[PDB]
Enzyme design. Structure first.
Site, PDB file in Angstrom:
ATOM      1  CG  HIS A 255       1.649   3.078  13.425  1.00 59.33           C
ATOM      2  ND1 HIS A 255       0.983   2.640  12.303  1.00 59.33           N
ATOM      3  CD2 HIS A 255       2.002   4.359  13.176  1.00 59.33           C
ATOM      4  CE1 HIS A 255       0.945   3.613  11.408  1.00 59.33           C
ATOM      5  NE2 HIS A 255       1.555   4.666  11.915  1.00 59.33           N
TER       6      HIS A 255
ATOM      7  CG  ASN B 291       8.466   7.917  10.016  1.00 63.77           C
ATOM      8  OD1 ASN B 291       7.734   8.699  10.627  1.00 63.77           O
ATOM      9  ND2 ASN B 291       7.996   6.904   9.297  1.00 63.77           N
TER      10      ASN B 291
ATOM     11  N   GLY C  23      -6.888   8.746   8.753  1.00 65.99           N
ATOM     12  CA  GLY C  23      -5.751   9.053   7.910  1.00 65.99           C
ATOM     13  C   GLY C  23      -4.765   7.916   7.789  1.00 65.99           C
ATOM     14  CD  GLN C  24      -4.421   2.298  10.354  1.00 64.62           C
ATOM     15  OE1 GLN C  24      -5.622   2.120  10.137  1.00 64.62           O
ATOM     16  NE2 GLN C  24      -3.640   1.366  10.917  1.00 64.62           N
ATOM     17  CB  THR C  25      -1.303   5.277   4.677  1.00 70.82           C
ATOM     18  OG1 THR C  25       0.083   5.131   5.029  1.00 70.82           O
ATOM     19  CG2 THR C  25      -1.779   6.708   4.863  1.00 70.82           C
ATOM     20  CB  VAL C  26       1.206   1.591   7.796  1.00 73.61           C
ATOM     21  CG1 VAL C  26       1.798   0.185   8.028  1.00 73.61           C
ATOM     22  CG2 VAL C  26       2.165   2.429   6.965  1.00 73.61           C
TER      23      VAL C  26
ATOM     24  CG  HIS D 164       1.017  -2.579  12.606  1.00 71.48           C
ATOM     25  ND1 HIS D 164       0.749  -2.676  13.955  1.00 71.48           N
ATOM     26  CD2 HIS D 164       1.851  -3.605  12.315  1.00 71.48           C
ATOM     27  CE1 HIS D 164       1.392  -3.715  14.455  1.00 71.48           C
ATOM     28  NE2 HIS D 164       2.067  -4.297  13.480  1.00 71.48           N
TER      29      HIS D 164
ATOM     30  CD  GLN E  18      -3.667  10.438  12.393  1.00 72.55           C
ATOM     31  OE1 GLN E  18      -3.630  10.298  13.619  1.00 72.55           O
ATOM     32  NE2 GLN E  18      -3.543  11.624  11.806  1.00 72.55           N
TER      33      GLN E  18
ATOM     34  CG  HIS F   8       6.007  -2.767   3.747  1.00 76.06           C
ATOM     35  ND1 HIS F   8       5.900  -2.167   2.511  1.00 76.06           N
ATOM     36  CD2 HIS F   8       5.246  -2.031   4.593  1.00 76.06           C
ATOM     37  CE1 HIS F   8       5.106  -1.115   2.605  1.00 76.06           C
ATOM     38  NE2 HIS F   8       4.695  -1.011   3.857  1.00 76.06           N
TER      39      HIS F   8
ATOM     40  CG  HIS G 289       2.700   8.661  13.910  1.00 72.42           C
ATOM     41  ND1 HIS G 289       3.386   8.647  12.720  1.00 72.42           N
ATOM     42  CD2 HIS G 289       1.577   7.937  13.704  1.00 72.42           C
ATOM     43  CE1 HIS G 289       2.708   7.956  11.825  1.00 72.42           C
ATOM     44  NE2 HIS G 289       1.604   7.513  12.398  1.00 72.42           N
TER      45      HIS G 289
END
Ligand SMILES: Nc1ncnc2c1ncn2[C@@H]1O[C@H](COP(=O)(O)CP(=O)(O)O[P@@](=O)(S)OC[C@H]2O[C@@H](n3cnc4c(N)ncnc43)[C@H](O)[C@@H]2O)[C@@H](O)[C@H]1O
Ligand SMILES: Nc1ncnc2c1ncn2[C@@H]1O[C@H](COP(=O)(O)CP(=O)(O)O[P@@](=O)(S)OC[C@H]2O[C@@H](n3cnc4c(N)ncnc43)[C@H](O)[C@@H]2O)[C@@H](O)[C@H]1O
Lengths: 125, 125
Positions: free
Chosen positions: A95, A26, A88-91, A93, A82, A7, A97
């Site tokens: 990136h 976030n 653990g990544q979920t998006v 990309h 991540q 997105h 934190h």
């Protein structure tokens, strides 16, 4: 504009944007000051970004780190990428934190996000 | 040679060394493949390293990440800089923690460390 995985992220939420990077807020900040820095390019894993887009994302992070630990009254920060789903990544990309920390130390509206973004935008003037 | 906070790290344990960075092994690896990348310069907080020593440490990390997730059979990694004591830092150096990850996933001798170092040294030939 502004891609972030499947997105798009609204400019209204983007508080920094470089030649190769961009930073945003976030919707569900672990802690206050939780902000991300992702490569402009939508590559999914670290080793995929060029050596240029690896300096920018992290030089930027550097700033975004010092402009957020400041505005949220931290005494230090915790950075953590991540990379990979076993990480653990979920998006999907690359990136970083950036979270501002305080001694022994969340959902929100687009508008509230638009403010946090706006507030921070000022330290990059 | 090789500085790392109050103490020096032996070359025998250093498996990579750049113009501005150096990488080494952990004596107490959280998980196998746990290796650090710290700026050559012994600055204590992130925002202290120049913008040059910020690209090197992370371009390097990039490699060290791909040369370790490989040799330890990871399917992705987890990177994380503990900047500032409120972040958890204990060695007063800027330094990244690269750990190779595996699905649903430690002290050791200088010599065993000297091997891990030696093994890895090979992927940078
Ligand atoms: N369209 C959209 N708009 C806005 N946001 C979006 C979006 N789409 C997706 N997102 C958003 O973008 C994000 C996607 O990122 P992600 O899916 O990659 C999550 P992660 O990378 O596994 O997180 P961390 O490791 S950093 O998390 C752990 C952190 O907590 C700290 N920590 C916890 N306990 C600690 C302890 N005891 N000591 C030290 N540190 C500790 C660690 O240092 C570390 O930095 C989501 O938030 C999503 O909603
Ligand atoms: N002379 C010397 N020789 C050799 N070594 C030395 C030395 N002197 C000092 N040292 C050595 O150098 C090190 C000094 O570093 P340090 O003191 O800064 C520790 P830290 O930065 O707080 O650690 P992390 O946040 S990375 O740790 C948490 C990590 O676990 C991962 N993790 C845990 N649970 C997770 C979960 N559920 N999901 C995802 N990730 C998880 C996180 O992603 C993260 O990367 C020491 O080891 C010392 O002995």
């Amino acid at each position: 504009s502004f891609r972030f995985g499947q997105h798009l992220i609204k400019p209204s939420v983007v508080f920094l944007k470089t030649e190769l990077s961009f930073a945003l807020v976030n919707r569900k900040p672990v802690v206050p000051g939780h902000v991300l820095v992702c490569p402009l390019r939508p590559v999914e894993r670290f080793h995929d970004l060029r050596p240029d887009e690896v300096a920018d994302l992290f030089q930027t992070t550097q700033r975004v780190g010092t402009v957020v630990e400041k505005h949220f009254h931290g005494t230090s920060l915790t950075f953590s990428m991540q990379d990979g789903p076993e990480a653990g990544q979920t998006v999907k990309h690359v990136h970083v934190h950036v979270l501002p920390r305080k001694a022994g130390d969340s959902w929100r509206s687009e508008e509230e996000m638009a403010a946090e973004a706006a507030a921070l935008r000022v330290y990059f003037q």
